Design a protein around this ligand. Structure first.
Ligand SMILES: NC(=O)c1ccc[n+]([C@@H]2O[C@H](COP(=O)([O-])OP(=O)(O)OC[C@H]3O[C@@H](n4cnc5c(N)ncnc54)[C@H](OP(=O)(O)O)[C@@H]3O)[C@@H](O)[C@H]2O)c1
Ligand SMILES: NC(=O)c1ccc[n+]([C@@H]2O[C@H](COP(=O)([O-])OP(=O)(O)OC[C@H]3O[C@@H](n4cnc5c(N)ncnc54)[C@H](OP(=O)(O)O)[C@@H]3O)[C@@H](O)[C@H]2O)c1
Ligand SMILES: NC(=O)c1ccc[n+]([C@@H]2O[C@H](COP(=O)([O-])OP(=O)(O)OC[C@H]3O[C@@H](n4cnc5c(N)ncnc54)[C@H](OP(=O)(O)O)[C@@H]3O)[C@@H](O)[C@H]2O)c1
Ligand SMILES: NC(=O)c1ccc[n+]([C@@H]2O[C@H](COP(=O)([O-])OP(=O)(O)OC[C@H]3O[C@@H](n4cnc5c(N)ncnc54)[C@H](OP(=O)(O)O)[C@@H]3O)[C@@H](O)[C@H]2O)c1
Ligand SMILES: CC(C)c1nc2nc(N)nc(N)c2nc1C(C)C
Ligand SMILES: CC(C)c1nc2nc(N)nc(N)c2nc1C(C)C
Ligand SMILES: CC(C)c1nc2nc(N)nc(N)c2nc1C(C)C
Ligand SMILES: CC(C)c1nc2nc(N)nc(N)c2nc1C(C)C
Lengths: 248, 249, 249, 247
């Protein structure tokens, strides 16, 4: 039968593109979402119209808390309940907002930014391994070493995700599970973002002076889960048009 | 008038060596501790005997929780209460134990390892910067972060997050004249209870001298980073590992 | 018109797999070689039997010297003269042997190791760019560059320079639509010649399957990078090492 | 006996600051230079005026060639000739200029940029080790991963120098020789004038100022000192946060 994948934060944008491209490759998919219920259901309907019984949605908040491990176990469980297997996990969901060093409480900021970007990936990785061409792909960030000003908590999360990618690649290799990352530079600028700000970001990218499409990011995910990546584990592929190479 | 420093997890081992060297350089010190109360009080006593009222102790669990931000604020507050100023913060305290992917619950392991290694350092950095010369913060990192111990994902995640904080905070606090740096030990001060035969196994791996670092050697790099000789150094992580991280499998 | 690629050191092993896989993908190929004349011609014959007029050979020493810039110019020229275009350059050729710090003279060792691994890639890159769709360059790097083989300083220096080239050329050539990326093998295709103890030693270190990479698995990463599926990827180095570089001493 | 140090490209700027600082800490120094004869002799004179017979100059081109190994061996030899010992080697000399991919020939550019920044440090390291608190400090670059546009050969050279620092740290550890790097960001602005200087200054998070030569030398002094006895294969960035700033 067809293999199955879980994509977190898959209702919209890059997660959606990844879900779509996995589905087109022949995967059954769990579209995880938090708030974007309408987009998630609409996406599932469309994939199911294409091939019957090949998409389900699964709602979960991925903020850190004492119940986060159970929420992550349930996400993996939902893939098994729908499809009887879980071959691919894609950790895409992410909170991203400034937390200056010098309104959400700081405890909430910690829980959202660290939970979504790192702890949930860890717990989902745990549940995925425990339930078992298996692989996990973590959505990282090409700019981790030249971070956005005042984004310390977000940056800490993405750094933690690099650590998880390496530790899990090492530990899960004996089980045949590969763990890799895809690190976007600037990708899919919101149509609603101010045009002046869009231009500012695009002007920075050496390759084409434009942001990645969501499909370009998805392409690298597709490579990593494929038979063409069978010896690749612990690798993080930047997909950033050379943005990380530009000095101040 | 003398500068003042907070050192977390300063009762024993590397934190102790750091507190002692800072004190010897002329700093007044807050000795933070968690369970090591006798060691901490004894250390403060020793330092105060050397110079009157230049050391205080401050107890706090640095596990992630709803009360962790207030706890970190109180650690910084304790430096100001005692000394009227806080010039240096050393984020040394750290939980370290395996968390295999395949009697603590996982949510507790997350809270302790991410809390001690990453979140508390963040909240302490926030309180330090907000409460404000040669100001700086030194984070105790790990030379082996990219070749981690098997089954230590949460620990390794916590230390990676700390590298991220060191960079983000260096960038953001530079306009405020606060430098933020790291010291990354390889193998240091193996536990006296570790069998010598196993101590020799890690020792044999170290290119420079086939031995682990003393706590004092780690402290030496901290002393440098807080000194006027490092006035243009920020966002830098100094490995103190005797070549360990350069050795292939 | 079918696109054309140059592969250096393509007569055998990994370079051969790259040439074969590019050819299978529809590329016409220049098979560069140094000493392996019989294998190079044999490979050309084989590919030409598959599709007429799709493979040629080009001999050159890639050791550094006063004549190297002309040699690299002629390698690129061979692609234009044969195929009327050059879309892809793969910098695979490499000298690899120990140069301890404490028959070849040291200046010869420098010329061979830095020439093959770094300077030739630079001059070929120069020639390729100046002679100019989906254009790209792939440099064969090394996943163990930061945990190098003992006594291989010159080899390691060359591979580090190659990372620098990959990055510098990615930045500079991005405006011309030329992408520049790397593939970094761990251990790959152990020779039968090598000892049974030595080969086992290396194999048992690889977390993912306790075996070396096949040449085809290395070639798969090259194919991805030159493909339309990597159109936004430049300055990236993809490790293909089965997790070898993650394993501590 | 006082320890002795070789500093390459030490007639001016950062090399001189390092030479001056080592001398002040008690070292006897070989001031290597290439073209800056007057400046080198002048520094040796000032240092010898402070302490008699504690400085000598040594001329050498560090461009790659077949005689480069002999030249590097002779630099180390000159320290032993003058001082009877050689405790510290600082690889500071560097060529730095653009070499675009698209009147110096390319073979000259390769020779100068790879020679000065990488091959000469390798050859000096060999000769330093062979001739034996011993250590080597390499002058690297904090911006190696966000390079100057059209400086590929320079960038390759400094990357090779990171590789040397790591390889030699590993290999020379059994011999008790530590090998470390100092990676400046922007330091000492000259050739260049204001306002281009102030364009660079505005980039630096920590004080919007370039590093002083003194600040770079401070980091060198630390790595050679007893306070760094367990540090080897480490590269210390001295860049005021410059490398942390995104485009
Ligand atoms: N776009 C870029 O320029 C860029 C750059 C670097 C890295 N990345 C990385 O690439 C990935 C995708 O980027 P993107 O722009 O598509 O991301 P995004 O739109 O910012 O986030 C994707 C999804 O994350 C989910 N999410 C947020 N908070 C959550 C929570 N508490 N619990 C569960 N889910 C939560 C949201 O789901 P709901 O909508 O259902 O609420 C959201 O749709 C992310 O990991 C991101 O960090 C992106
Ligand atoms: N030792 C090494 O080989 C090595 C290697 C790499 C990195 N490092 C890093 O260097 C630093 C010093 O190492 P070390 O071996 O001296 O450290 P350690 O003994 O393992 O821990 C230092 C202190 O951290 C405090 N701590 C632990 N859990 C805590 C909690 N939940 N709340 C508050 N404090 C807590 C403890 O205080 P109490 O005793 O008072 O309870 C302990 O004394 C650490 O950051 C470590 O990760 C060390
Ligand atoms: N194999 C591995 O485990 C491994 C590990 C890390 C990195 N890599 C990298 O992957 C690439 C392929 O590895 P490999 O093992 O297939 O390589 P290899 O067999 O060691 O060498 C490839 C070719 O390099 C050519 N070459 C050597 N010296 C030359 C010179 N002076 N001038 C021109 N060409 C010269 C040779 O051509 P002729 O035979 O025609 O003389 C040789 O066939 C290399 O860049 C290597 O550094 C490989
Ligand atoms: N200054 C910065 O902003 C900066 C930034 C990053 C890294 N760095 C690194 O820090 C170190 C010092 O910087 P700097 O600006 O003081 O250096 P520099 O002035 O550009 O050069 C130092 C010396 O190198 C010598 N040199 C150049 N070509 C030579 C050759 N072919 N053979 C022998 N010697 C040669 C010159 O000696 P003569 O004058 O005697 O001919 C020169 O005085 C260098 O390694 C540099 O790459 C500096
Ligand atoms: C498209 C814009 C709004 C954007 N959105 C992001 N979303 C997440 N989750 N993570 C990022 N690093 C992220 N980064 C950007 C850019 C600022 C790079
Ligand atoms: C002395 C031994 C038990 C040891 N203890 C440690 N403690 C903390 N907190 N962090 C480490 N990275 C750490 N690392 C080691 C060694 C394995 C290096
Ligand atoms: C399989 C053996 C002979 C081997 N051969 C190599 N050849 C080149 N050119 N480069 C390497 N890094 C290289 N590395 C190895 C192993 C030590 C991995
Ligand atoms: C002060 C200016 C002229 C400058 N000079 C340099 N000299 C050398 N040798 N190396 C550099 N990386 C170097 N870099 C700069 C800046 C452009 C950073």
């Amino acid at each position: 039968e067809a293999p199955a994948a879980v994509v977190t934060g898959a209702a919209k944008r890059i997660g959606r593109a990844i879900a779509v491209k996995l589905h087109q490759t022949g995967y059954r998919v769990v579209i995880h979402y938090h708030n974007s219920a309408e987009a998630a259901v609409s996406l599932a309907d469309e994939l199911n119209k294409e091939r019957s019984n090949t998409a389900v949605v699964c709602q979960a908040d991925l903020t850190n808390s004492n119940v986060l491990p159970a929420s992550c176990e349930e996400i993996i469980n939902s893939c098994f309940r729908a499809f009887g297997r879980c071959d691919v996990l894609v950790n895409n969901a992410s909170a991203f907002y400034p937390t200056p060093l010098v309104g959400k409480t700081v405890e909430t900021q910690v829980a959202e930014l660290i939970g979504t970007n790192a702890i949930a990936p860890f717990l989902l990785t745990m549940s995925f391994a425990q339930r078992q061409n298996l692989s996990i792909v973590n959505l990282c960030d090409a700019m981790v070493d030249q971070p956005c000003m005042a984004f310390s908590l977000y940056n800490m999360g993405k750094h933690a995700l690099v650590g998880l990618t390496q530790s899990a690649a090492l530990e899960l290799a004996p089980y045949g599970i590969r763990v890799n990352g895809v690190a976007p530079g600037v990708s899919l600028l919101p149509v609603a973002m101010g045009e002046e700000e869009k231009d500012k970001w695009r002007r920075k990218v050496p390759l084409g002076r434009r942001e990645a499409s969501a499909e370009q990011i998805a392409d690298a995910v597709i490579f990593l889960v494929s038979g063409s990546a069978q010896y690749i584990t612990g690798s993080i592929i930047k997909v950033d048009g050379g943005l990380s190479l530009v000095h101040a």
